């Protein structure tokens, strides 16, 4: 059997062949800090497992991907690789943490936010896991003077820009959202009443947002929008938690539910506008 | 010296102690498919390198993080770990590809898009690296009937939802953007004129968007906004390529430059509105 480390080196060969179209022994030696004989043995094992993927060129002393290349691992897929380029450009990871070979010039939009402390995220995650209540300070636009609350968190949500904790608010007796960047966790409240998170109907009930191309588009433009949004059969059925519906519409700029008279500024419309309106009124209550 | 594999296992111990607050030998054995003696040796090496971070509890047979814990690697930082939770929830990676231990219930907004083929991304990346021209089919809202162009790509951009190639358009004689999900790459055009990407002024000129809290906010609300946006000293200086300015403003909902009379719907305003307007007119030209 192939051990975990060597398998990661086979993944590295596979992804370099897929995107760079070539790999040298020295690329393996430098990334993984292995010897020339081990790196040659890794390339030999890749040749044994998937010989049609690559040829060795003795003039250039390099392995070249063939036109027949097929990745041996799903970890070489395009969504993952584009996500890696985003993480490198945003500085989330360093080049020595990534299998990416050629790094193109990249421009990625910036999401300005408060850097969160690991210790606070950790306290929240463990409180979720252990179903325990936390005394916190929280400040908001409607209540900017920091105020203390007792919260029992049970989930995390990401709205496209920032994270929030989904939690029972013991004072207001509701499940609701708390931006993690606005929370100061102070101590545990072990005497608080246990909360059943299965009672958070907004979090646990999934709903469907049915999206279609704006009906004022020509058939040719419709096909463009369909391809842009990965629509199968002329619509896109987006599934989300009811308590994530508002965030989802904001993330996709779908908050204006009416079908406008301007197709060019509204490529996609929500088919089930009345369901969506109703679901948001229920959840904000 | 510690080898690459064992160092990844030390990283795994560090991140489990930071967020789960505990780790068992069997967690290492199962994730990395190693023997009990090797996993014990990894935990012993972690104890040697950072003994104040953890204690072994013989009653529970588990290693517990201490209140004094300090991560031995920056790879345990919170931005990375929250990014991992996002990638797991979006299905970008599988649990066996991630060091995340406890996985909370998560809700993440959905970005509907066309799944891109690795082979097309690969052809584009290599064309960027080798500075070669490509014959492509492209369809857009303004020109929906697929049309062929000769493009020399030199960079990639991400607008918050989708990727584009930055490229010289040989027919229209301009540098401009092409959504990768709308591109069909057909063949290389080796007889085309070479293009100097240093002549793409929009791509290479960085500009500053100066952001401040809306001036109608009370001082207490201002402090909330400042914390939300990670503002140092009452403003945020966002740096981006001129050719990414429009995408940046759209991603942050800053396209309406005027200072509105409604602080609650416009938490942040652009200080240098006239510079930004001018820079966008230059770039769309």
Tell me how far apart the alpha carbons of residues B198 and B207 are, in angstroms, rounded to a whole number: 16
Which of helix, strand or coil describes residue A234?
coil
Asked if B39 and B25 touch (Cβ cutoff 8 Å), the reply is yes
Residue B87 and residue A92: Cβ atoms within 8 Å? Answer: no
Residue of B110, B139, B155, B235 for testing the chain A interface, max A β-carbons within 10 Å: B110
DSSP secondary structure letter of residue B52: G
Question: What residue ranges define each of the domains in chain A, with the CATH number in brackets?
Answer: 4-97 (1.10.10), 118-197 (2.30.30), 205-283 (no CATH)
HSE, CB side, 13 Å, CA atoms: give it for residue B26.
3
How many CB atoms within 10 Å of residue B209? 23
Closest residue, chain A, to B84 (C-alpha): A92
- The first and second tokens of residue B97, run together, are 């590809």
Which of helix, strand or coil describes residue B59?
coil
Q: Does B71 touch chain A (CB under 8 A)?
A: yes
Q: How was this structure determined?
A: X-ray
Residue B241 and residue A122: Cβ atoms within 8 Å? Answer: no
Residue B121 and residue A197: Cβ atoms within 8 Å? Answer: no
Resolution in A for the shown PDB structure? 1.9
Asked if A227 and A185 touch (Cβ cutoff 8 Å), the reply is no
Task: Considering only CA atoms, give the Rg of chain A.
Answer: 25
Residue B118 and residue A71: Cβ atoms within 8 Å? Answer: yes
- The first and second tokens of residue A249, run together, are 């519409």
Asked if B249 and B214 touch (Cβ cutoff 8 Å), the reply is no
HSE, CB side, 13 Å, CA atoms: give it for residue B25.
14
Q: For residue B246, is it left (φ>0), alpha (ψ between -120 and 50) or beta?
A: alpha
Q: List the beta bridge partners of residue A183.
A: A138
Which of helix, strand or coil describes residue B193?
coil
- The first and second tokens of residue B230, run together, are 């990670």
Identify the CA nearest to A160 among candidates A248, A237, A222, A88.
Answer: A248
Residue B107 and residue A81: Cβ atoms within 8 Å? Answer: no
Q: Does A19 touch chain B (CB under 8 A)?
A: yes
How many CB atoms within 10 Å of residue A133? 21
Asked if A211 and A231 touch (Cβ cutoff 8 Å), the reply is yes
**Which residues from B are below 8 Å from A107, CB to CB?**
155-158, 166, 203, 240-241, 243-244
Between the alpha carbon of residue B144 and those of residues A230, B84, B161, B169, B181, the distances in Å are 16, 37, 21, 17, 14
User: Looking only at Cα atoms, what is the longest distance across chain A?
Assistant: 74
Residue A161 sits at φ, ψ, to 5 deg, of -125, -35
- The first and second tokens of residue B55, run together, are 């204690």
Interface A-B: count of C-beta contacts within 8 A: 271
Burial of A204: CB neighbours in 10 Å, binned 0-12, 13-18, 19+: middle
Tell me how far apart the alpha carbons of residues B99 and B144 are, in angstroms, rounded to a whole number: 44
């Amino acid at each position: 059997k192939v051990r975990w480390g060597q398998n990661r080196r086979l993944n590295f060969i596979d992804v370099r062949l897929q995107y760079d179209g070539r790999i040298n022994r020295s690329d393996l030696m430098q990334f993984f800090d292995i010897s020339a004989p081990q790196a040659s043995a890794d390339l030999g094992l890749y040749q044994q497992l998937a010989g049609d993927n690559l040829v060795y060129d003795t003039r250039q002393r390099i392995y070249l991907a063939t036109p027949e290349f097929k990745p041996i691992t799903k970890r070489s897929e395009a969504t993952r690789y584009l996500n890696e380029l985003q993480r490198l450009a945003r500085g989330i990871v360093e080049p020595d943490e990534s299998f990416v070979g050629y790094q193109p010039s990249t421009g990625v939009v910036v999401s300005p936010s408060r850097a969160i402390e690991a210790d606070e995220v950790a306290t929240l995650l463990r409180a979720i896991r252990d179903r325990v209540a936390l005394r916190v300070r929280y400040q908001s636009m409607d209540a900017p003077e920091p105020q203390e609350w007792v919260l029992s968190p049970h989930a995390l949500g990401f709205d496209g820009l920032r994270w929030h904790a989904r939690a029972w608010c013991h004072a207001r007796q509701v499940f609701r959202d708390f931006a993690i960047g606005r929370l100061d966790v102070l101590e545990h409240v072990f005497s608080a009443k246990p909360v059943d998170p299965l009672l958070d109907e907004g979090w646990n009930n999934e709903v469907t947002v049915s999206l279609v191309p704006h009906p004022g588009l020509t058939p040719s433009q419709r096909r463009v929008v369909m391809r842009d949004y990965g629509m199968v059969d002329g619509h896109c059925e987006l599934r989300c938690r009811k308590a994530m519906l508002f965030y989802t519409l904001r993330h996709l700029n779908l908050e204006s539910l009416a079908i406008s008279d301007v197709p060019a500024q509204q490529h996609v419309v929500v088919e089930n506008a009345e369901e969506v309106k109703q679901w948001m009124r229920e959840d904000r209550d």
